[PDB]
Design an enzyme around this catalytic site. Structure first.
Site, PDB file in Angstrom:
ATOM      1  N   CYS A   1       0.826  -1.203   0.000  1.00 18.64           N
ATOM      2  CA  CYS A   1       0.000   0.000   0.000  1.00 18.64           C
ATOM      3  C   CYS A   1       0.866   1.261   0.000  1.00 18.64           C
ATOM      4  O   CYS A   1       1.572   1.523   0.966  1.00 18.64           O
ATOM      5  CB  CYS A   1      -0.950  -0.034   1.225  1.00 18.64           C
ATOM      6  SG  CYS A   1      -1.977   1.483   1.371  1.00 18.64           S
TER       7      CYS A   1
ATOM      8  N   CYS B   1       0.531   3.673   2.907  1.00 24.33           N
ATOM      9  CA  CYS B   1       1.240   3.061   4.077  1.00 24.33           C
ATOM     10  C   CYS B   1       2.762   3.265   4.080  1.00 24.33           C
ATOM     11  O   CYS B   1       3.336   3.538   5.128  1.00 24.33           O
ATOM     12  CB  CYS B   1       0.955   1.560   4.184  1.00 24.33           C
ATOM     13  SG  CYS B   1      -0.673   1.141   4.776  1.00 24.33           S
TER      14      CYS B   1
END
Ligand code: ZN
Ligand code: ZN
Ligand code: ZN
Lengths: 149, 143
Positions: free
Chosen positions: B67, B70
């Site tokens: 991600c 992230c």
């Protein structure tokens, strides 16, 4: 549920490999060793260190006294044995190191080094004091102890 | 001043720490890991389960390396940890490496943050934000 370990320790950079080590405040005289490379952390001797180790060591919980020197400079050469005698005297209270400003040309600008030999006293990332010019071991020890007091 | 139950985020061991000495670098009496480091620990679901119940608030980043937000959030979460050192402990848990933990926490979007204290969820947020904003949010929930 057990109690946490609350004994005070000091962050010491290993002057041989740069590893951050934690030394119990009560073991300053026990010859502690770096957990990574085995080098003694508190030897009472003078280590010749490089710019990466220096930047780390400046931030230590035990005071660091650094001789910025160059081998072409007569007074620096004469000072070397005086600085070693100061190290023996200050063993356990102050760690001593030296850095050759000819071998490592960027360090002089970083610390605004002027005349050499230059001695800078560091503690927890702050410069506490400095002095420049060769002098007897006991005079330097006195200067250092005065600044730590 | 009181004594606080903290879970060692390394070993899992319950440690007792006086609340007035959180800056004294207390160590786990079992494994020796620093209990209050001001850094982000990558933890596993067993340790998470225990640490949720601690007497010092715990803020957990549910993340995954695939991600992009992230990955971007990771150094912001480290900045937040430095800022909150002694007030809140920060941990992250890789929901790809631990594929059941997100479902068990009703997590949909990541990064997701859950703030715990004494077995209670104090707050939840989802989506990357700057360190200042996360710190502000967390501090607001604690007073
Ligand atoms: Zn070493
Ligand atoms: Zn432990
Ligand atoms: Zn949970």
């Amino acid at each position: 549920m057990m109690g946490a370990k609350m004994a005070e320790s000091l962050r010491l950079t290993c002057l041989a490999c740069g590893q951050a080590n934690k030394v119990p405040s009560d073991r300053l005289a026990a010859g502690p060793k770096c957990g990574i490379c085995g080098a003694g952390l508190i030897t009472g001797k003078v280590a010749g260190i490089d710019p990466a180790i220096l930047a780390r060591a400046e931030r230590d919980d035990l005071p660091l006294l650094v001789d910025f020197w160059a081998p072409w400079c007569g007074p620096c050469r004469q000072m070397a044995p005086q600085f070693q005698a100061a190290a023996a005297t200050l063993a356990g209270q102050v760690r001593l190191a030296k850095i050759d400003t000819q071998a490592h040309p960027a360090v002089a600008g970083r610390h605004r080094i002027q005349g050499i030999p230059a001695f800078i006293l560091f503690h927890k990332g702050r410069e506490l004091a400095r002095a420049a010019g060769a002098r007897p071991a006991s005079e330097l020890v006195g200067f250092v102890r005065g600044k730590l007091g």
